[PDB]
Design a protein. Structure first.
Length: 49
RNA sequence: UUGAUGUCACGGAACCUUUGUUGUCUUCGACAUGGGUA
């Protein structure tokens, strides 16, 4: 894992190293015409895009 | 820019010869997506 800010529950064992961020976006997306089983188990209402 | 007693230049068809031709079924099913977990 990598965190710029130290997590509250794990404040020990973190090493600061230089590097770059490979930023692309929410690319892992599955789209379907019909409601999937995972979507059918969603609690509440589906937010807009 | 002529020369003189002598100019058929209306004396001479830019004329003659070469195929835009050749080759192609308006046809049709498997994915797309990048991690996540530890």
């Amino acid at each position: 894992k990598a965190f710029q800010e130290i997590p509250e529950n794990d404040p020990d064992g973190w090493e600061c190293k230089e590097g770059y961020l490979h930023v692309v976006g929410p690319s892992k997306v599955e789209f379907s015409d019909k409601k999937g089983d995972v979507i059918n188990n969603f609690q509440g209402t589906l937010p807009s895009v």
